[PDB]
Amino acid sequence: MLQPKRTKFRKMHKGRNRGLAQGTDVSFGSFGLKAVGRGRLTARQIEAARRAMTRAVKRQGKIWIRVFPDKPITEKPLAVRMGKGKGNVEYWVALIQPGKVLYEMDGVPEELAREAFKLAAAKLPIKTTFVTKTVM
Amino acid sequence: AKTIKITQTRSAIGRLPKHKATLLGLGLRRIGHTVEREDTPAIRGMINAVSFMVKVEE
């Protein structure tokens, strides 16, 4: 389950999630799973998807994770009122914009890659599409 | 030196203060009010600023 080893600060402003993604090409492998939707991916979701695709390929080829969950998300406990300081960090997320390549794969046939990424995509809260490396 | 006719087509109610100040600059007072003004870049810029609520007969 991915998490920054350390951070300069513990808590982060909510912020917003506008714009299109940077890292829209299959840069490392042959095949990619690309976000077409917008949202947050938790470290748990990223891991669940990784396990699904890794099992599918049966330790064949190589898998890259292009996204890293570096944004800490706080929550307030049950039965506490508003205010009294910002809540405690509970989990980490990666902000996803449309076009973001999430995972890449190499060293498998395209049919197996499509199958593995289909099984991964079912774990994710964002709509995805299968992509391949281009010349340009 | 030519003039142009400018007519206010929509209400000033709820518009930005700068837009109301621009209508005042053109001398437009109410919906349907037509004024005759000299055709200059300064006048054209005022029309441009409130073009959504004026019509020009040039």
């Binding site: 299109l20 829209t24 690309k34 976000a35 449309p98 076009g99 599409t129 010349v135 340009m136 | -």
Partner: protein, 93 residues
């Protein structure tokens, strides 16, 4: 590879988005002594061509008005998440 192109009349964001809504896309030819030439291309025709890998290696012919310009594809801007082309740079060969 032969590509029919028209010279662009309007330029900028508004013009470019209107092109793509009408199933065309903008492109640019530059290089050599001659000034750059901004062109419109048919989207489906070029998208089918550039699926072939020879499109990026080989010298292409762009037919603009009634003049055949030899070029190579220099850069492509793809749509972030759709199988579509936003823009192509062509260099004069």
């Amino acid at each position: 590879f032969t590509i029919n192109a028209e010279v662009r009349k309007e330029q900028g964001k508004g013009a470019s988005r209107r092109l793509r809504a009408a199933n065309k896309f903008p492109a640019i030819i530059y290089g050599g002594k001659e000034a750059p030439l901004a062109i419109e291309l048919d989207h489906d025709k070029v998208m089918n061509m550039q699926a072939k890998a020879e499109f990026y290696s080989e010298v292409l012919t762009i037919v603009v008005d009634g003049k055949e310009i030899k070029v190579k594809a220099q850069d492509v801007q793809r749509h972030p998440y759709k199988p579509k082309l936003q823009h192509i740079d062509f260099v004069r060969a």
